[PDB]
Amino acid sequence: IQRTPKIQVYSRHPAENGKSNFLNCYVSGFHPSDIEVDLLKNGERIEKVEHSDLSFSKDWSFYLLYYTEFTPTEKDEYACRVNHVTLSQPKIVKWDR
Amino acid sequence: QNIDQPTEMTATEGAIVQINCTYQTSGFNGLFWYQQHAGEAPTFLSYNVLDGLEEKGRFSSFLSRSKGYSYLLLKELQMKDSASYLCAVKDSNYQLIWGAGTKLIIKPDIQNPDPAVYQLRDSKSSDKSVCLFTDFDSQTNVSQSKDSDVYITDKCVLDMRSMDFKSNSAVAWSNKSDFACANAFNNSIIPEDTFFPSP
Amino acid sequence: MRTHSLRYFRLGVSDPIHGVPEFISVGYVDSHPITTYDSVTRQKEPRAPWMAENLAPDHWERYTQLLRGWQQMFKVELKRLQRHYNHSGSHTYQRMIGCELLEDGSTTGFLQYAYDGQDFLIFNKDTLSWLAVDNVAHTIKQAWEANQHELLYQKNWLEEECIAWLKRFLEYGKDTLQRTEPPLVRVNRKTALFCKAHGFYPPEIYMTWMKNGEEIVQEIDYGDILPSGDGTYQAWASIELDPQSSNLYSCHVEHSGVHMVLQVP
Amino acid sequence: NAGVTQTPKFQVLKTGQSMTLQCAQDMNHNSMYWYRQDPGMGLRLIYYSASEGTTDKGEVPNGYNVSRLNKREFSLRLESAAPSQTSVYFCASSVWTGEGSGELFFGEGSRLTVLEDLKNVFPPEVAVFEPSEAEISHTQKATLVCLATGFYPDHVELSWWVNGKEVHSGVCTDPQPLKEQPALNDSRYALSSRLRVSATFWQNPRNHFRCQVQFYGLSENDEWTQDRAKPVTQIVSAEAWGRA
Ligand SMILES: *Cc1cc2nc3c(=O)[nH]c(=O)[nH]c3nc2cc1C
Ligand SMILES: [Cl-]
Numbered sequence A: 001i002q003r004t005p006k007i008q009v010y011s012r013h014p015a016e017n018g019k020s021n022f023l024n025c026y027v028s029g030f031h032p033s034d035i036e037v038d039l040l041k042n043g044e045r046i047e048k049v050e051h052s053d054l055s056f057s058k059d060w061s062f063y064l065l066y067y068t069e070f071t072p073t074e075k076d077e078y079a080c081r082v083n084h085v086t087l088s089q090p091k092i093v094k095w096d097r
Numbered sequence B: 001q002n003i004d005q006p007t008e009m010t011a012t013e014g015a016i017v018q019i020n021c022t023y024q025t026s027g028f029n030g031l032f033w034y035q036q037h038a039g040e041a042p043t044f045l046s047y048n049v050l051d052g053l054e055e056k057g058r059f060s061s062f063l064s065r066s067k068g069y070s071y072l073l074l075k076e077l078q079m080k081d082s083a084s085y086l087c088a089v090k091d092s093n094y095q096l097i098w099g100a101g102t103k104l105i106i107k108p109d110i111q112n113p114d115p116a117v118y119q120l121r122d123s124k125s126s127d128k129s130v131c132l133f134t135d136f137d138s139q140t141n142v143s144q145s146k147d148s149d150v151y152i153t154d155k156c157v158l159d160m161r162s163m164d165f166k167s168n169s170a171v172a173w174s175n176k177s178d179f180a181c182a183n184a185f186n187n188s189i190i191p192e193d194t195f196f197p198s199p
Numbered sequence C: 001m002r003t004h005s006l007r008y009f010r011l012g013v014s015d016p017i018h019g020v021p022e023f024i025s026v027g028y029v030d031s032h033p034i035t036t037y038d039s040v041t042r043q044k045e046p047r048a049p050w051m052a053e054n055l056a057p058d059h060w061e062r063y064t065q066l067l068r069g070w071q072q073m074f075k076v077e078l079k080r081l082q083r084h085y086n087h088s089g090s091h092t093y094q095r096m097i098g099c100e101l102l103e104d105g106s107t108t109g110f111l112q113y114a115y116d117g118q119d120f121l122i123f124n125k126d127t128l129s130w131l132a133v134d135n136v137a138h139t140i141k142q143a144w145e146a147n148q149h150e151l152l153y154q155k156n157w158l159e160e161e162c163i164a165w166l167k168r169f170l171e172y173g174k175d176t177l178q179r180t181e182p183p184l185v186r187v188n189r190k191t192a193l194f195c196k197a198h199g200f201y202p203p204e205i206y207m208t209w210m211k212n213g214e215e216i217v218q219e220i221d222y223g224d225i226l227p228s229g230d231g232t233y234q235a236w237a238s239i240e241l242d243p244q245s246s247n248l249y250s251c252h253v254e255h256s257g258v259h260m261v262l263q264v265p
Numbered sequence D: 001n002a003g004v005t006q007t008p009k010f011q012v013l014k015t016g017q018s019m020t021l022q023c024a025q026d027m028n029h030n031s032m033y034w035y036r037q038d039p040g041m042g043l044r045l046i047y048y049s050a051s052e053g054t055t056d057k058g059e060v061p062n063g064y065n066v067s068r069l070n071k072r073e074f075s076l077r078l079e080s081a082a083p084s085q086t087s088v089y090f091c092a093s094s095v096w097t098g099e100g101s102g103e104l105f106f107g108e109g110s111r112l113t114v115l116e117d118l119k120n121v122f123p124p125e126v127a128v129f130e131p132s133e134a135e136i137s138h139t140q141k142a143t144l145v146c147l148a149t150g151f152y153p154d155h156v157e158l159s160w161w162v163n164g165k166e167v168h169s170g171v172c173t174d175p176q177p178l179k180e181q182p183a184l185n186d187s188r189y190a191l192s193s194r195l196r197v198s199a200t201f202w203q204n205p206r207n208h209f210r211c212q213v214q215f216y217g218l219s220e221n222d223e224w225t226q227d228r229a230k231p232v233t234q235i236v237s238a239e240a241w242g243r244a
Helices: C057-085 C135-145 C148-172 D133-139
Strands: A006-011 A021-030 A036-041 A062-070 A078-083 A091-094 B002-004 B008-012 B017-024 B031-036 B043-048 B052-056 B059-064 B069-074 B083-090 B096-098 B102-107 B116-119 B129-134 B150-152 B156-160 B165-174 C004-013 C023-029 C032-038 C044-046 C092-101 C107-115 C118-124 C129-132 C184-189 C192-200 C206-211 C220-222 C233-240 C249-255 C258-264 D004-007 D010-014 D019-025 D031-037 D044-051 D054-057 D064-068 D074-078 D087-094 D110-115 D125-129 D141-151 D156-162 D165-167 D171-173 D189-198 D208-215 D234-241
Touching: A006 A078, A006 A091, A021 A036, A021 A078, A036 A062, B002 B083, B002 B096, B008 B017, B017 B031, B017 B083, B017 B102, B031 B069, B043 B052, B043 B059, B043 B069, B069 B083, B116 D133, B129 D141, B156 D171, B156 D189, B165 D141, B165 D189, C004 C057, C004 C148, C023 C057, C023 C148, C032 C057, C044 C057, C057 C092, C057 C135, C057 D044, C057 D054, C092 C148, C107 C148, C118 C135, C129 C135, C135 C148, C184 C249, C184 C258, C192 C206, C192 C249, C206 C220, C206 C233, D004 D087, D019 D031, D019 D087, D031 D064, D031 D074, D044 D064, D044 D074, D054 D064, D074 D087, D125 D208, D125 D234, D133 D141, D141 D156, D141 D208, D141 D234, D156 D189, D189 D208
Parallel strands: B008 B102, D010 D110
Antiparallel strands: A006 A021, A021 A062, A036 A078, A078 A091, B002 B017, B017 B069, B031 B043, B031 B083, B052 B059, B059 B069, B083 B096, B083 B102, B116 B129, B129 B165, B150 B165, B156 B165, C004 C023, C004 C092, C023 C032, C032 C044, C092 C107, C107 C118, C118 C129, C184 C192, C192 C233, C206 C249, C220 C233, C249 C258, D004 D019, D019 D074, D031 D044, D031 D087, D044 D054, D064 D074, D087 D110, D125 D141, D141 D189, D156 D165, D156 D208, D171 D189, D208 D234
């Protein structure tokens, strides 16, 4: 069976405009393991983006955490973009704060 | 980490022998027993990893993890059981630690002891005189020579399969002028009824 | 202590795209990765500093050899499964083994396998037998159960060795694994009440909404426990507000032996 | 169906000389091992190979190296022989490793003696002694004795041949050799064997008895500078005929 990834985008701390923070994109429950993730800033692809090693769940699916340091402002919109074998096209999830 | 077993054990044919193996290890993934006949390769006898006794023909193997000890139990002993028995333990990293081995010596049941010392015939190609101590009971031990020019071998068990007949023997030889079979085994404690044929 | 666990996973892939490893194995203590190995590095490496600092090089070298051997065995096993399924293309094989030391002192132990992310074989260490999900697994089950000693070995490793490894690693990483960081909890309005916790360690946390004292399981929306990225976690749970009758709603959070209540006035 | 095949069976070496021991297994095993066995202690791992394409040191790696040539073969190299490498070497294999349950399958063993100087290698002198007439009349059995004496190192195989066929029934050979001079670390050795037959078998004048000792010693490339004959690998024997 193939399992499509669950995508959640959130900040490390409660966001406050002007206060430095970390944008997280936690991608879980997918199978098989090949996957492609990007953090977006205003629809552009952020360059310096870290991620954990591929992780394993008891139910045999996988999970990953992609993140980047940032300072949230009122205007800039932030997103996570995921591609997987289960997806016809990339799936974009915006940071709803 | 260390593993300990007795150096050597002696039992009588037809009886039962228990060979012990104690081990101190960090971690435990199993205990193996191996049989090694003299001059030959060890071969797998048994494996224990949970507690208790497992039987396999005449051999049984026992394990107590909490005591860190195992024994190999051999019943109805036969001469072909003469061998070294090697105990080995798999430690927490799946590395084998080997005991030094236990040499099992089996005493044949001699049905009609007839102890005697015979002089063999000289060979024209050798200066040695040769004496054979033979047919004695298995409780008799053969001592090494006290004279540096006298050679005495340890006792050997021979099987005449056609007659289903076993016998102990030891050989002594020398080329000294004063050497005689009547005194060849004078350093051994030999049966009082030992037959010494007239020279 | 609290409950702790030790688990090792293996992933094997039959026809991996270029770059992606054929084989990967990762160990975990609770949610923390502790060790990793793959077919590209061919080396076992720590994934937690307190593992690196407490295990001499002879340990990393020994399991590097063992892992290279396990990688080849895993390839052979995946090859046989995909022949017996008569399957083309790329397929995955997975294994999970480990144990739990519970707070009450009792222990559990598990070992299981998956093919294409679905249960394939499950070990039962009390009946010393394998549960097969289909007839390819049943063929493998017959061969594994014919070697009774290998079953006994797994029982011993799960009940004794794994628990001893877990206690040893729990001591190594005790400053991490045995600490408590209490949650910061608030209630926001979005209509629905959202109860949000963050900043907490360990990750195990129970959040729920009460209405007038009774619970409302079918009405609560539970969010996942999520890594913040700094070693702590966050979570939430929402409840949909009734606009036709007032009710006393309260959020209830339990973490590491402490219960909290946030009444929404 | 061969199991584990290792060579050579016996080897003598001068200090400083090189040697490669061969090992092959036809069992389709993945794990292979080289052990040394010495008196008074357990087997010690020298090197091992958990799987094709990887090898690593054991407990006593110094002075040795290994090559896992393929799935089947695992060779042990001594590059500069030292007297402390005098030992019996055993190659072994197992289906896998890092499983707890699997036993090892051992090769036949390689007996290596390393010497500072080959000047104390000797073949055995072999003599056969005919049965005692007193024994024949007292027991109706006849014991022949073969003595193999003065050889060094203890690299011999003694066999008995009756009417041109090797025999084992009725035979007992000392399991351990006798040090002719017990106090010396390089003492030459003695070995005895008995063959016991019925008196009626001994008393047939057409029956032929022979004791043969195969000695494993020097070879063509070994340098020899003593006045006596070069102690090469050879067979030494002695015979007797039945006596009416
Ligand atoms: C470092 C490591 C060790 C390990 N040990 C295992 C063991 O002893 N038994 C198993 O069945 N599986 C194991 N897997 C591993 C994996 C890793 C990475
Ligand atoms: Cl992809």
